[model samples]
Target: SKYSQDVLQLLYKNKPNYISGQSIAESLNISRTAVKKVIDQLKLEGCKIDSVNHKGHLLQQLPDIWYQGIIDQYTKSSALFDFSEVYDSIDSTQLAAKKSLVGNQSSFFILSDEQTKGRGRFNRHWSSSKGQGLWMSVVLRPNVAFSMISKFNLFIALGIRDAIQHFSQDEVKVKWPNDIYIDNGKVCGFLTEMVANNDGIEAIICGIGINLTQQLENFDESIRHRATSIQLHDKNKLDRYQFLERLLQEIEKRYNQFLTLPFSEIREEYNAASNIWNRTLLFTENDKQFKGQAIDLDYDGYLIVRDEAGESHRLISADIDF
Candidate 1:
């Protein structure tokens, strides 16, 4: 399976033409028998490879899914992530990342076609169709404490917002904490869980889900009016592979900058991309509840809300509702 993608990418590089079997085997340092085996596997995976007498193989079509070979092609030289993987279906990418944490200490990313037990902000049920959205999680062992992660969800939202904006001309905004909204419809959501243990600290697992190509019928009844996908706005076939490449690049670039950039400047950029201004919402701090109008963001990217009593509160953590 590993060499299959290598051969496939090579074939992709020279499609609509034939490359000899000797060249394919020599390029991959494998025997002609191994090349035939991988080609057979690719054909079984829905690829149309025509192997003729003297011309070798021609790739006519490919499977419309992201594979290890495809991922390596994009991330082979990427600096941030040290390891990567793709899954056909899994309990959750977050759960998978947790498993990799044992006896492992490398920055990694994983993408799944489906998450059978996908979770939301607070163990909420996150519904997803197979291979229709971006179900991804990145694992990082940072040198920061738990307090440093308070603004991380918001920081990650900025990357998701900018990446989507690059693909479509729609106005994308980051909802306070972590959610992406366009036209008041939720398109993206994420969760950041700081991993720690008796060993003091571990890593940060950031799980992100972006609705890419779902149509109206793809949504559940209750969320149909408020949940949306990028394809609904663009009405064009969304390429998950291309979009994911851009998404990782933006997130990595933003993440690298997040570590070094000043909180003042980061706050400025976050507020500019935020959709949290001028909205009536309820949030709880300490043991009291406050109904307020979202007005500003503090230097730390925390929500600055003016309560009904006209007192302004900079929230560190709140169960937000609209």
Candidate 2:
């Protein structure tokens, strides 16, 4: 793994410029054959390396990859994700996080290149095309009341929205309860699961799936009109590692503030980003559908919906259909 990483960093540093096989071998103290083998392996791993006559090898495209090493390199000891792991492919990061309760990391994360059974709210299937998007589940053991969890999710959504806007230079919206939209389609989705007792909370598993590189054809016909990606809209190509690094940075920033600042201060930001507030919409409550106007988020994070009868319903667990 070190050899692979060393070779990748070397090639990445001189991207678009050819470096001879002998030169690479000399740099990493390996034989030319070994260098070629690594290059072949990298190619199999989906990295594009241009090998031509007399021109040597040029890294045309860096691999869409991230791991604990990248997390360690980007974050310090103060980081929330003190422990992390990367799976080439896994059933689901959220499921893995539950099994990971044994090790009991104060804070950690599980990342996968693809998820065979990734899920969302109401158990909707999450399609994760290998090496095309980010599917991550995080576990945090924060000292906070159970009621404060909704605010934490809001902070997480804002963090994602902010990072996306920074990279794409486009408007990013946060759809209530747990989704992010851009260009009129959903670019990201979130699911929050937690562990708690009578007095307080223990751990929170934060699941997030972000579409980064997929285009219209990459998705199924049913989802093509509703799903979008960051690279689909940005003219400038994305570096997956760079975008991931910035995402962690933004998340950490907002998460730290949530621990100190008043939730009221950030209420306006989420309301500004959502499409549900102050708008009449069809929402389902206990399998009963009703058209009501969502006034705003109450202090406890419940939605205040005013129905035709002028009744204020504190929507606790309901789906807002716009």
Candidate 3:
């Protein structure tokens, strides 16, 4: 029988050691037998029941979320964040941040429990279910040029990669524009949106979605080969909350340097993290195809490609799989 999928969802959301069967049935307003059946179904889905008996069920390992534990790791300090929890639903955290920024508010972090309609570069869909991955939107009101908005996406890629590296030595690479991948499958992505003030970008929202503990079967057949999770690549579990906190710490450090340092410095650092430098790549844009040697990431974060015909094009937007 079908139940509110969120019933199991709620158990995993808390990541608790155990929950009483009575509590579960009361919450779901169903018979204890029904709840037990659902728990059995969850066990099939890879939930590690810690201790199960007359007392209740416990989840030994569960999915991650935005919480105090994650915040502690992110700041490496106990007092860095003032808020940490979950949002029920949102189009994108960036959109939510945009509203707060327009009101001239202090900087804050927003983590959505689920993003029904998230976005990526060129307005692409960002996959995020309630507890499938880490979906976040950060707001930063830095004093910078309106055109320099592209740098934010690159910054996020670098920051997230550094955090992932801390967990393991998996090969992490950034696809041109806004994707972070390992083994040619995307592990995370970034989306940046901004509003201008006169000649500068007054406010900016950077959204990030990471595939943390997603099951292989959760993805569609067409994208299963293309989308991946940390567990998928490493055969190990990652604490999503910890990973998010690590990124926040990394981004905060880089952001400070970005404000005071030169673009050349950031570009140099970005090259070390970039995936396509000195590699022959195929770029598809404007319905045109070209094979070129990727030379560098331009000041605006565009890929600088020298085509076979000796003609050079600064690609503002394009898709490259290799």
Candidate 4:
């Protein structure tokens, strides 16, 4: 591990410029031939390393390391924090969280390199190619009333959207319910599942999927038209581990603030970030399809839609086609 890690350190330090093989060998106390071999290994592992004829090597982008270290370092000392688990492959992070909840688990983060049964709202299939995106679930046990539970999705959406915007510098908007969008294409989505007992809600598992580094061809033909990745918008590569740290920190900060502040505060911001407002959309409720112009979200965070008959409808949940 230190062998690859030492090479990573060298590349990271001389980022955006080539470091001579001789310089690397002298610095790391390895032979020049060994330096070349390590660079080849890094490239094989998916790191984009450019080796110039006379100039040695430069790393264009680093590979995604299974980075539980970031989560471990951030949560190890905190009272609210639980263990962070990473899987090479899994059915779903949400499913894993649900299983843990049966054993009275809380405040844990579960991540998987790939999800064989990843899903979205309405139980639609989600694409999660290995080493391509952020597939994670955050487990929380909040004491909020049932009425306020709908707003939790928006709270986490705002936190994640902000975290992504910090890197993207793109105008990211929140779609109603839990999806995040850049322009008209989807970049991220979240599903919040609650486990309740007689007393109150026992746990909330927030399953989040972000299209981070997927290429255009990585998507299926159906969703290729509607999905976009962070790398597509920005060519500058990102370190997945660093991005996860920023995301977790932001989520925790917002989660704490939401516990003390009113939902209206976060709702206002969500409204501003929402792209559903004033857009013509089609949605079905109770098997009845209705076409309407998306109106503003009410103070309670429900979507207010005005139908063709000049009637306003409040939608708690619906399958929206936009």
Per-candidate total of colliding backbone pairs: 0, 0, 2, 0
State the lDDT of candidate 1 residue by residue for 4-66, as single tens digits.
778987887677799988999999999988988898888888887889978888977545466
Tell me the whole-model lDDT of each prediction, alpha carbons only.
0.80, 0.80, 0.70, 0.79
The top-ranked prediction according to TM-score is 1
TM-scores for all predictions: 0.86, 0.84, 0.72, 0.80
Q: Write the per-residue lDDT of candidate 2 for residues 22-122, one digit (tens) a residue.
A: 88899989888898888899899787888886878887766777644445544444457777877889999999998886556468888898999989898
Candidate 3 residue-wise lDDT, 1-322, digit = tens: 4663645555655565567888878877889888878767766655557646766776665344443333423333423343433476777777777776675644566788788888777777777877777788777778788877766666666777777667655788777677888766788887777878778876777777888777778887778888878777665567665566577788777677666766666777778777776777887776687788888777766777888798888876667756
Best to worst by TM-score, what's the order?
Answer: 1, 2, 4, 3
Q: Which stretches of model 1 miss by more than 4 angstroms? A: 1-3, 12-18, 27-64, 197-201, 284-290
Q: Per-residue lDDT of 1-322 in model 4, one digit per residue for the tens?
A: 3466577667766777899988888887988888778878878878888898898788776567564543455577556667878787999998888888776756888888899999987788988888888999888989866555677776788888888777775788878788888886788988988887666787888899998887778888888878888777775777787787788878888788767876687767788898887777887777688788877777776778888778988876656768
| Deviating ranges (above 4 Å) for candidate 4 | 1-62, 77-80
Give stretches of model 2 more than 4 Å off: 9-33, 43-61, 65-72, 75-78
lDDT for residue 81 in candidate 1, whole number 0-100: 86
Q: How many residue-pair clashes does candidate 1 contain?
A: 0
How far residue 272's Cα lies from its native spot in candidate 3, in Å, is 2.8
Which ten residues in a row are the worst by lDDT in model 1? 61-70
- Please give me the total number of clashing residue pairs in predicted model 3: 2
